[PDB]
Structure formats: C-alpha cells, structure tokens
C-alpha cells in the first residue's frame, strides 16, 4: 500500500493515541452487531444475543485486542503486508473459510470507530489514508483465496 | 424494524441545522477516499471549502430528511431521484455503498453520543434501503 | 417488471422434471467453484454422485418453482426459508450471489435456446430478489 | 493463479474451440444488458436502447474482440497476470474510472457465455478452473487502483 510521506505521518500520529486495549473490542463488537452473520465464527464466545451483551462480552474484548495488534503490525510494515499477514491468511482462508468480503467490512467498521473516538481530528484526508491501510490489510488477509 | 425507524428518526433528528455541513463533509470524505467518484461531478470545485460541494451536500442531506419522514413509503417519495440517479446519471451501485459508509463516518465524528452500536446498525440498514430505491431501475 | 415475470415463468417452466438434476448440478458447481460454501454442509456426502446432494438439489429447485408461482408475494411465501437461512443458519449474503451464478450457468448449459440476453437479465433479477428475501432478516 | 496440470489443459483445450471475435462481443453485449449502468462507459457506441440493438451493434462486437484478446494473453501467462494486465489496470483506473466490481461481473458473464456455447462440455470441474482464471484476471485489472 502506497502512502505519501504526509499520509504516513498522519496515520502514525493518530494511531499513537489509540487505546490498544479498547478499540479492537469496539470494532469487533460492532462487526458482530451490524453484520450478525459474522457471529457464526464466534459461537464459543458465549452471550451475543443483544448489542449490550456483545459489547460487554470479555472474549470479544480479548479477541478484539489481538485483531488490533495485527493491524498495528500492519502499520509498522506497510511495504510488506502480504508477508506480515501470511499465517493469518492461512488461518482465516484454509482453516476458518471466512468469506473475504467480511475482511472489507471489519476494516470499515474500524474506520467508523476511529471516527467515533477522534471526532473532528479524524479529518477527511486522515480517513482517506486509513481507507488505503484497511483495504491493504483486507487484501493481504485474502491472499490465500487468490 | 420498528426499533430501526425509532433509532433513525432520533439520530437523524439531531442533525438539525448541521444537515448541509454533514452532507458536504460526507461528499468530501467520499471524493478523497474513493477518487473514482469525482468523475460524476465534471465541473465542480471539489476543494475543501467549496461552495458548490456545500450546496450539493445540503440537497443530499435534505433528501435524507425527506426519506426519514417517509420511511414506510420511500419508493414513492424518492421516485424522481431514482429517475435521476439510475436512468439519467447511470450511477454505479457500488458508489451508494461508498457514500453510505462516508455518511456513517461523518455521523460518528459529529454525534458520538448518538452513534451507539444499535443506532449504527439501524442507520446502515436505512441507507442501504435508500440506496436500493435510488438504483431500483436495474 | 411485467416482462421479467413473463421471461422467468417461460424459462423456468421449461425446467419441468429436470428440477432436481439442475439444482444438484448447480450445487455441485458451487461446491467445486467456491469451496468455502462447503462449510454450511458439514454433515453431507459432497462427492460427485451423492444421493444427499441430489435430494437437496430437488428441494432448492422446488423452492424456486414456488418462488416463481408467488413472484408478487415472495416475502410471505419464502417466510420459513428466510427464518432458516438468515435466523438459524446465518448464511453470509455473498453465498447467494454464488449460488445464483451457478444456477444461471446450469440453465445456460441445459436450455441454450431459452437463455437469451433478455431472459438472462430477468433470471438474474429474479435470483437476486429471492436472495434478498432469504437473507432479509 | 494456481491451476493443477489437469485444470490447465482442460482450460486450454476448451479455449481452442472459442471463436475469437464472436464470444467477446457476446460477453460484452450481455454485460451491457444484464448490468445497464455499464452503458455509461460506452455512450459513443451509439444505439444501446434494447437487447437486440446492443447485440447487433458493430462497436460492441469490435470492442468485444479486444477484450477477449486480452483474456487470451492472460491464459498464456497465468503465472504473471498482474504484469500482463499492468498497463490495462492503469487505463481502466486512471483514464476510464471503472469501478473494479465491474471486472468481476464481466468475468462471470463470460463464464455464462462459455456455458451457453458448450453445454454439457462446460462441466463443473471445467467451470471451477475458469472461475479461478476470471477471478485472477479481475484481481490483476484492479491491481493499479492500489
Ligand atoms: C480484517 C482484519 C482481521 C485481522 C487483522 C484479524 C486478525 C486475527 C488474529 C490476530 C487472530 C488471532 C491470531 C492467533 O492468536 O492465533 C484472528 C483469529 C480469528 N479471526 Fe480474525 N482478523 C481479521 C478479520 C476477521 C474477520 C472479518 C473474521 C470474521 C468472522 C475473523 C474471525 C476470526 C476468528 C473466528 C478467529 C479465531 C480466534 C480463536 O479461535 O480464538 N477475523 N484474527
Ligand atoms: C444517499 C445517497 C444519495 C442521495 C440522497 C443523493 C441525492 C441527490 C440529490 C438531492 C441530487 C440533486 C437533485 C436535484 O436537485 O437535481 C442529486 C444529484 C446528483 N447525485 Fe446524488 N444522491 C446520492 C448518491 C449519489 C452517489 C453515490 C453519486 C455518485 C458517486 C451521486 C451523484 C449525483 C450527481 C452527479 C448528481 C447531479 C448533480 C449536478 O450536476 O447538479 N449521488 N443526488
Ligand atoms: C435461491 C437460493 C436458495 C434456495 C431456493 C434454497 C432453498 C432451501 C431449501 C428448500 C432448504 C431446505 C427446506 C427445509 O428443510 O425446510 C434449504 C436448506 C439449506 N440451505 Fe438453502 N436455498 C438457497 C440458497 C442457499 C445458499 C446460497 C446456501 C449457502 C450456503 C444455502 C444453504 C442451505 C443449508 C445449509 C440448508 C440446510 C439443509 C440441511 O441441513 O439439510 N442455501 N435451502
Ligand atoms: C475484465 C476484463 C476486461 C478486459 C480484459 C478489458 C480489456 C480492455 C481492453 C483491451 C481495452 C482496449 C485497450 C486499448 O486498445 O488501449 C479496453 C478498453 C475499455 N474498457 Fe475494458 N476490459 C475489461 C473490463 C471492462 C469493464 C468491466 C468496463 C466497463 C464497465 C470496461 C470499459 C472499457 C472502456 C470504456 C474502454 C474504452 C472503450 C472506448 O474506446 O470507448 N472494461 N478494455
Ligand atoms: O494474488 C493476490 C494478490 O493480490 C494483490 O493485491 C496483488 C496482493 O495483495 C496478492 O498477492
């Protein structure tokens, strides 16, 4: 994924203020609420029957933290997303068989969550840079389909 | 659902006088994130302050308030916009998903207290319905 | 459109007694072309001759004949299938596009005289309308 | 795109029987009928107001031929689709502004046309091999958009 130097430091600057313990669970939780078929993949996580149950579920939160961590690895290695996400692509594609359209949905939910938290500071140019990043992650996760 | 209609009317009703500002922001977000969309606007000044984008944002946002007021009745209420977007402009349906996403991003940034997970779900469904209507001659 | 309803009824009505054969072919096409779709059938024999795939093909094809007969009234007629596919099974809406494509490919291969450009258009719209209903909840 | 040897020679065998000329215009014509927004990109082609006008339009035919010629280049270079389509990816994005979802639609229309022509011979394993190819082509055409 090809970012301008401008875009690069706007992304890294904003991400430094992200609560690594929270935003992942907020993003994952919203995926499961907004796009309820995604719950199929998380049956062992227990109670997901209502929005409040999803957001307050400690496994969504704990798994959310891992998902966000992989996004951070991505941000540290934008010239090598395919390599960075290679074993996770195996997992999500060969083992879990998650349809890749769902990778594009999570990426966009994460963008809505960043907007929710940063308000005015999540400017349109900043969004445009994060859209390139999350598309790059989704495409790297899908590498084993194609 | 009935709870979807409640959540949309509550969240959107708080846009109030900011309608134009948010519609314009959403368009700007779309143009920067998804630059293929800019070809539909051949002479527009699409820079950040643009009077033209602000005027257009207000029309878009006002059509959404009208869709909110006619939720049960949208095919009839948005009839002329479907004519325009599907027969005349031939807007690719992908681009409605792109603007819908940018409208949700805009509302999340301005109305954080309102943009709960449930409200987000409802808004996403409402915008997809509006998009089906606008692209429905296909 | 009214012409769409005419084209679907004419084309589908010429499936007749091949309904089960074509549904089973369409499923097989889907499972081979898009292998992620196999996880929804963890307890099926999905090998090429399967009795289970043939039986299931017949049900799918017969639900489509029922959707043809109730074109104007599909949310009500397919109500129990929407329950099943959206509330119980939780099928990703991508998969409906995938099966719809494999159904059109099957009809193109078996009914070439019927699969004109206009009929293809109509069938494609019809299968998308069936898919929204089935995923609508 | 990774095909088995079996898959490779089934694809090559079936493509040898393809009328280079005629299938391209049928595929392109069906795109314009089944997905009418695609007509926006072809206003200079003249009469597109009905299915018969689209299929019998000599510019649809002539342009169809070019599209299908690029598909044949693809089949000759399956280990290098991104490279093979690099200039065309540029053209479709920077010059024509085609949304990449439309690439996936054409590919599937082409699959329907092959099935229409070859009937029983377009077996499910043969379809599966062609679906890998048209996905690979659509992905390669979308490569310079990011
Ligand atoms: C798009 C970006 C995504 C990233 C960066 C991501 C990252 C990860 C990571 C880091 C893990 C755990 C690695 C490990 O500890 O072994 C994982 C597991 C998983 N992911 Fe994702 N993921 C993504 C999308 C998705 C989506 C969209 C789904 C949709 C249903 C999904 C479902 C899962 C599941 C079910 C697991 C298994 C966890 C377990 O068994 O504990 N992931 N993912
Ligand atoms: C929620 C979705 C949308 C709404 C509510 C909406 C609403 C409107 C309205 C109210 C107008 C002006 C009607 C008039 O006074 O003539 C219009 C025009 C237009 N819309 Fe949209 N629209 C939407 C989506 C889109 C998308 C996705 C695109 C392109 C990517 C698009 C492109 C246009 C264009 C080009 C015009 C013509 C403007 C001009 O040159 O004056 N619209 N739309
Ligand atoms: C036009 C599209 C479709 C039609 C008409 C259709 C029809 C049906 C019918 C009639 C049944 C069983 C009836 C019953 O038990 O009450 C069923 C079950 C099922 N369908 Fe579909 N279906 C469609 C699409 C799909 C798709 C795209 C999937 C994708 C994975 C799918 C997966 C299933 C599954 C897993 C079952 C449960 C069957 C079992 O366990 O025996 N269907 N469908
Ligand atoms: C997916 C496979 C496709 C292939 C292999 C393909 C290939 C080509 C080729 C080879 C050309 C001419 C290159 C030249 O001589 O410079 C071209 C032009 C063009 N393509 Fe495509 N294309 C595809 C899909 C699409 C789609 C889906 C659209 C529109 C919806 C599209 C729109 C066009 C347009 C508008 C032109 C220029 C036509 C003109 O001269 O007015 N293409 N494409
Ligand atoms: O083969 C799929 C390929 O598509 C790309 O965008 C190019 C890569 O991320 C991946 O290797």
PDB file of N, CA and C and ligand atoms in Angstrom, chain C residues 27 30-31 36-42 44 52 56 58-64 67 78 80-81 84-85 89 91-100 103 127 130-131 134, ligand 3:
ATOM      1  N   UNK C  27     -25.609 -26.893  -7.267  1.00  0.00           N
ATOM      2  CA  UNK C  27     -24.903 -27.060  -6.001  1.00  0.00           C
ATOM      3  C   UNK C  27     -23.481 -27.594  -6.231  1.00  0.00           C
ATOM      4  N   UNK C  30     -21.344 -24.915  -7.484  1.00  0.00           N
ATOM      5  CA  UNK C  30     -20.982 -24.030  -6.388  1.00  0.00           C
ATOM      6  C   UNK C  30     -19.863 -24.634  -5.510  1.00  0.00           C
ATOM      7  N   UNK C  31     -20.005 -25.920  -5.101  1.00  0.00           N
ATOM      8  CA  UNK C  31     -19.070 -26.516  -4.121  1.00  0.00           C
ATOM      9  C   UNK C  31     -17.677 -26.649  -4.687  1.00  0.00           C
ATOM     10  N   UNK C  36     -15.444 -22.519  -0.002  1.00  0.00           N
ATOM     11  CA  UNK C  36     -15.936 -22.005   1.278  1.00  0.00           C
ATOM     12  C   UNK C  36     -17.402 -22.318   1.527  1.00  0.00           C
ATOM     13  N   UNK C  37     -18.192 -22.513   0.479  1.00  0.00           N
ATOM     14  CA  UNK C  37     -19.592 -22.801   0.648  1.00  0.00           C
ATOM     15  C   UNK C  37     -19.842 -24.194   1.266  1.00  0.00           C
ATOM     16  N   UNK C  38     -18.858 -25.077   1.203  1.00  0.00           N
ATOM     17  CA  UNK C  38     -18.982 -26.428   1.806  1.00  0.00           C
ATOM     18  C   UNK C  38     -19.116 -26.470   3.312  1.00  0.00           C
ATOM     19  N   UNK C  39     -18.590 -25.466   4.016  1.00  0.00           N
ATOM     20  CA  UNK C  39     -18.747 -25.458   5.485  1.00  0.00           C
ATOM     21  C   UNK C  39     -20.169 -25.397   5.977  1.00  0.00           C
ATOM     22  N   UNK C  40     -21.132 -24.945   5.174  1.00  0.00           N
ATOM     23  CA  UNK C  40     -22.547 -24.952   5.610  1.00  0.00           C
ATOM     24  C   UNK C  40     -23.162 -26.346   5.590  1.00  0.00           C
ATOM     25  N   UNK C  41     -22.467 -27.326   5.007  1.00  0.00           N
ATOM     26  CA  UNK C  41     -22.962 -28.701   4.862  1.00  0.00           C
ATOM     27  C   UNK C  41     -21.941 -29.657   5.461  1.00  0.00           C
ATOM     28  N   UNK C  42     -21.534 -29.391   6.723  1.00  0.00           N
ATOM     29  CA  UNK C  42     -20.519 -30.246   7.342  1.00  0.00           C
ATOM     30  C   UNK C  42     -20.920 -31.713   7.426  1.00  0.00           C
ATOM     31  N   UNK C  44     -22.799 -33.530   5.176  1.00  0.00           N
ATOM     32  CA  UNK C  44     -23.147 -34.105   3.856  1.00  0.00           C
ATOM     33  C   UNK C  44     -22.014 -34.891   3.202  1.00  0.00           C
ATOM     34  N   UNK C  52     -27.459 -37.494  -1.174  1.00  0.00           N
ATOM     35  CA  UNK C  52     -27.749 -36.316  -0.386  1.00  0.00           C
ATOM     36  C   UNK C  52     -27.724 -34.971  -1.195  1.00  0.00           C
ATOM     37  N   UNK C  56     -31.106 -32.726  -1.874  1.00  0.00           N
ATOM     38  CA  UNK C  56     -31.079 -31.330  -1.545  1.00  0.00           C
ATOM     39  C   UNK C  56     -31.297 -30.429  -2.774  1.00  0.00           C
ATOM     40  N   UNK C  58     -33.150 -31.063  -5.258  1.00  0.00           N
ATOM     41  CA  UNK C  58     -34.600 -31.089  -5.548  1.00  0.00           C
ATOM     42  C   UNK C  58     -35.364 -30.085  -4.685  1.00  0.00           C
ATOM     43  N   UNK C  59     -34.969 -29.965  -3.426  1.00  0.00           N
ATOM     44  CA  UNK C  59     -35.632 -29.035  -2.519  1.00  0.00           C
ATOM     45  C   UNK C  59     -35.398 -27.609  -2.915  1.00  0.00           C
ATOM     46  N   UNK C  60     -34.154 -27.311  -3.350  1.00  0.00           N
ATOM     47  CA  UNK C  60     -33.765 -25.967  -3.731  1.00  0.00           C
ATOM     48  C   UNK C  60     -34.541 -25.581  -4.977  1.00  0.00           C
ATOM     49  N   UNK C  61     -34.549 -26.492  -5.946  1.00  0.00           N
ATOM     50  CA  UNK C  61     -35.238 -26.267  -7.206  1.00  0.00           C
ATOM     51  C   UNK C  61     -36.754 -26.122  -7.023  1.00  0.00           C
ATOM     52  N   UNK C  62     -37.338 -26.965  -6.174  1.00  0.00           N
ATOM     53  CA  UNK C  62     -38.759 -26.865  -5.857  1.00  0.00           C
ATOM     54  C   UNK C  62     -39.120 -25.571  -5.094  1.00  0.00           C
ATOM     55  N   UNK C  63     -38.273 -25.101  -4.176  1.00  0.00           N
ATOM     56  CA  UNK C  63     -38.471 -23.743  -3.562  1.00  0.00           C
ATOM     57  C   UNK C  63     -38.427 -22.592  -4.615  1.00  0.00           C
ATOM     58  N   UNK C  64     -37.594 -22.741  -5.637  1.00  0.00           N
ATOM     59  CA  UNK C  64     -37.581 -21.785  -6.748  1.00  0.00           C
ATOM     60  C   UNK C  64     -38.857 -21.808  -7.614  1.00  0.00           C
ATOM     61  N   UNK C  67     -41.252 -19.957  -5.516  1.00  0.00           N
ATOM     62  CA  UNK C  67     -40.979 -18.539  -5.709  1.00  0.00           C
ATOM     63  C   UNK C  67     -41.501 -18.027  -7.066  1.00  0.00           C
ATOM     64  N   UNK C  78     -41.781 -17.191   1.026  1.00  0.00           N
ATOM     65  CA  UNK C  78     -40.479 -17.753   1.417  1.00  0.00           C
ATOM     66  C   UNK C  78     -40.147 -17.515   2.912  1.00  0.00           C
ATOM     67  N   UNK C  80     -40.551 -19.009   5.809  1.00  0.00           N
ATOM     68  CA  UNK C  80     -39.889 -20.060   6.601  1.00  0.00           C
ATOM     69  C   UNK C  80     -38.422 -20.251   6.124  1.00  0.00           C
ATOM     70  N   UNK C  81     -38.151 -20.024   4.841  1.00  0.00           N
ATOM     71  CA  UNK C  81     -36.791 -20.145   4.338  1.00  0.00           C
ATOM     72  C   UNK C  81     -35.905 -18.993   4.775  1.00  0.00           C
ATOM     73  N   UNK C  84     -34.946 -19.870   8.239  1.00  0.00           N
ATOM     74  CA  UNK C  84     -33.921 -20.885   8.238  1.00  0.00           C
ATOM     75  C   UNK C  84     -32.565 -20.321   7.808  1.00  0.00           C
ATOM     76  N   UNK C  85     -32.521 -19.661   6.647  1.00  0.00           N
ATOM     77  CA  UNK C  85     -31.250 -19.247   6.056  1.00  0.00           C
ATOM     78  C   UNK C  85     -30.682 -18.054   6.868  1.00  0.00           C
ATOM     79  N   UNK C  89     -29.334 -20.660  10.182  1.00  0.00           N
ATOM     80  CA  UNK C  89     -28.048 -20.939   9.539  1.00  0.00           C
ATOM     81  C   UNK C  89     -27.076 -19.746   9.456  1.00  0.00           C
ATOM     82  N   UNK C  91     -26.446 -17.644   6.935  1.00  0.00           N
ATOM     83  CA  UNK C  91     -25.637 -17.738   5.705  1.00  0.00           C
ATOM     84  C   UNK C  91     -25.201 -16.333   5.241  1.00  0.00           C
ATOM     85  N   UNK C  92     -23.902 -16.181   5.049  1.00  0.00           N
ATOM     86  CA  UNK C  92     -23.337 -14.947   4.510  1.00  0.00           C
ATOM     87  C   UNK C  92     -24.010 -14.618   3.146  1.00  0.00           C
ATOM     88  N   UNK C  93     -24.523 -13.373   2.957  1.00  0.00           N
ATOM     89  CA  UNK C  93     -25.161 -12.990   1.668  1.00  0.00           C
ATOM     90  C   UNK C  93     -24.334 -13.096   0.448  1.00  0.00           C
ATOM     91  N   UNK C  94     -23.013 -13.077   0.575  1.00  0.00           N
ATOM     92  CA  UNK C  94     -22.162 -13.420  -0.576  1.00  0.00           C
ATOM     93  C   UNK C  94     -22.578 -14.772  -1.201  1.00  0.00           C
ATOM     94  N   UNK C  95     -22.897 -15.779  -0.380  1.00  0.00           N
ATOM     95  CA  UNK C  95     -23.097 -17.135  -0.897  1.00  0.00           C
ATOM     96  C   UNK C  95     -24.309 -17.217  -1.833  1.00  0.00           C
ATOM     97  N   UNK C  96     -25.277 -16.317  -1.648  1.00  0.00           N
ATOM     98  CA  UNK C  96     -26.462 -16.281  -2.507  1.00  0.00           C
ATOM     99  C   UNK C  96     -26.158 -15.816  -3.888  1.00  0.00           C
ATOM    100  N   UNK C  97     -25.281 -14.804  -3.979  1.00  0.00           N
ATOM    101  CA  UNK C  97     -24.682 -14.463  -5.295  1.00  0.00           C
ATOM    102  C   UNK C  97     -23.980 -15.657  -5.991  1.00  0.00           C
ATOM    103  N   UNK C  98     -23.251 -16.446  -5.212  1.00  0.00           N
ATOM    104  CA  UNK C  98     -22.512 -17.572  -5.724  1.00  0.00           C
ATOM    105  C   UNK C  98     -23.423 -18.652  -6.238  1.00  0.00           C
ATOM    106  N   UNK C  99     -24.489 -18.940  -5.511  1.00  0.00           N
ATOM    107  CA  UNK C  99     -25.419 -19.976  -5.995  1.00  0.00           C
ATOM    108  C   UNK C  99     -26.243 -19.503  -7.148  1.00  0.00           C
ATOM    109  N   UNK C 100     -26.675 -18.261  -7.069  1.00  0.00           N
ATOM    110  CA  UNK C 100     -27.366 -17.631  -8.198  1.00  0.00           C
ATOM    111  C   UNK C 100     -26.563 -17.703  -9.503  1.00  0.00           C
ATOM    112  N   UNK C 103     -26.630 -21.354 -10.671  1.00  0.00           N
ATOM    113  CA  UNK C 103     -27.921 -21.643 -11.287  1.00  0.00           C
ATOM    114  C   UNK C 103     -27.998 -21.116 -12.710  1.00  0.00           C
ATOM    115  N   UNK C 127     -33.335 -14.037  -9.225  1.00  0.00           N
ATOM    116  CA  UNK C 127     -32.494 -14.765  -8.249  1.00  0.00           C
ATOM    117  C   UNK C 127     -31.957 -13.810  -7.209  1.00  0.00           C
ATOM    118  N   UNK C 130     -35.017 -13.238  -4.847  1.00  0.00           N
ATOM    119  CA  UNK C 130     -35.100 -14.407  -3.958  1.00  0.00           C
ATOM    120  C   UNK C 130     -34.021 -14.346  -2.865  1.00  0.00           C
ATOM    121  N   UNK C 131     -32.822 -13.903  -3.232  1.00  0.00           N
ATOM    122  CA  UNK C 131     -31.702 -13.805  -2.272  1.00  0.00           C
ATOM    123  C   UNK C 131     -31.839 -12.737  -1.203  1.00  0.00           C
ATOM    124  N   UNK C 134     -34.313 -14.183   1.331  1.00  0.00           N
ATOM    125  CA  UNK C 134     -33.721 -15.229   2.148  1.00  0.00           C
ATOM    126  C   UNK C 134     -32.682 -14.759   3.171  1.00  0.00           C
TER     127      UNK C 134
HETATM  128  C1  LIG E   3     -32.089 -19.381  -4.380  1.00  0.00           C
HETATM  129  C2  LIG E   3     -31.366 -19.847  -3.347  1.00  0.00           C
HETATM  130  C3  LIG E   3     -31.753 -20.911  -2.362  1.00  0.00           C
HETATM  131  C4  LIG E   3     -32.887 -21.671  -2.217  1.00  0.00           C
HETATM  132  C5  LIG E   3     -34.072 -21.544  -3.133  1.00  0.00           C
HETATM  133  C6  LIG E   3     -32.725 -22.558  -1.073  1.00  0.00           C
HETATM  134  C7  LIG E   3     -33.664 -23.461  -0.606  1.00  0.00           C
HETATM  135  C8  LIG E   3     -33.517 -24.261   0.523  1.00  0.00           C
HETATM  136  C9  LIG E   3     -34.424 -25.263   0.976  1.00  0.00           C
HETATM  137  C10 LIG E   3     -35.751 -25.591   0.319  1.00  0.00           C
HETATM  138  C11 LIG E   3     -33.899 -25.849   2.109  1.00  0.00           C
HETATM  139  C12 LIG E   3     -34.488 -26.989   2.968  1.00  0.00           C
HETATM  140  C13 LIG E   3     -36.002 -26.938   3.274  1.00  0.00           C
HETATM  141  C14 LIG E   3     -36.291 -27.248   4.725  1.00  0.00           C
HETATM  142  O1  LIG E   3     -35.543 -28.031   5.371  1.00  0.00           O
HETATM  143  O2  LIG E   3     -37.279 -26.696   5.278  1.00  0.00           O
HETATM  144  C15 LIG E   3     -32.657 -25.191   2.350  1.00  0.00           C
HETATM  145  C16 LIG E   3     -31.781 -25.546   3.345  1.00  0.00           C
HETATM  146  C17 LIG E   3     -30.476 -25.124   3.349  1.00  0.00           C
HETATM  147  N1  LIG E   3     -29.866 -24.213   2.527  1.00  0.00           N
HETATM  148 FE1  LIG E   3     -30.708 -23.311   1.057  1.00  0.00          FE
HETATM  149  N2  LIG E   3     -31.566 -22.331  -0.530  1.00  0.00           N
HETATM  150  C18 LIG E   3     -30.904 -21.385  -1.244  1.00  0.00           C
HETATM  151  C19 LIG E   3     -29.637 -20.856  -1.077  1.00  0.00           C
HETATM  152  C20 LIG E   3     -28.684 -21.310  -0.205  1.00  0.00           C
HETATM  153  C21 LIG E   3     -27.351 -20.905  -0.160  1.00  0.00           C
HETATM  154  C22 LIG E   3     -26.694 -19.832  -1.023  1.00  0.00           C
HETATM  155  C23 LIG E   3     -26.717 -21.596   0.827  1.00  0.00           C
HETATM  156  C24 LIG E   3     -25.288 -21.340   1.081  1.00  0.00           C
HETATM  157  C25 LIG E   3     -24.511 -21.954   1.963  1.00  0.00           C
HETATM  158  C26 LIG E   3     -27.687 -22.482   1.381  1.00  0.00           C
HETATM  159  C27 LIG E   3     -27.546 -23.398   2.418  1.00  0.00           C
HETATM  160  C28 LIG E   3     -28.598 -24.174   2.931  1.00  0.00           C
HETATM  161  C29 LIG E   3     -28.404 -25.072   4.102  1.00  0.00           C
HETATM  162  C30 LIG E   3     -27.168 -25.369   4.926  1.00  0.00           C
HETATM  163  C31 LIG E   3     -29.569 -25.676   4.358  1.00  0.00           C
HETATM  164  C32 LIG E   3     -29.849 -26.709   5.467  1.00  0.00           C
HETATM  165  C33 LIG E   3     -30.080 -28.118   4.861  1.00  0.00           C
HETATM  166  C34 LIG E   3     -29.811 -29.346   5.733  1.00  0.00           C
HETATM  167  O3  LIG E   3     -29.084 -29.332   6.763  1.00  0.00           O
HETATM  168  O4  LIG E   3     -30.327 -30.436   5.381  1.00  0.00           O
HETATM  169  N3  LIG E   3     -28.877 -22.274   0.695  1.00  0.00           N
HETATM  170  N4  LIG E   3     -32.427 -24.274   1.341  1.00  0.00           N
END
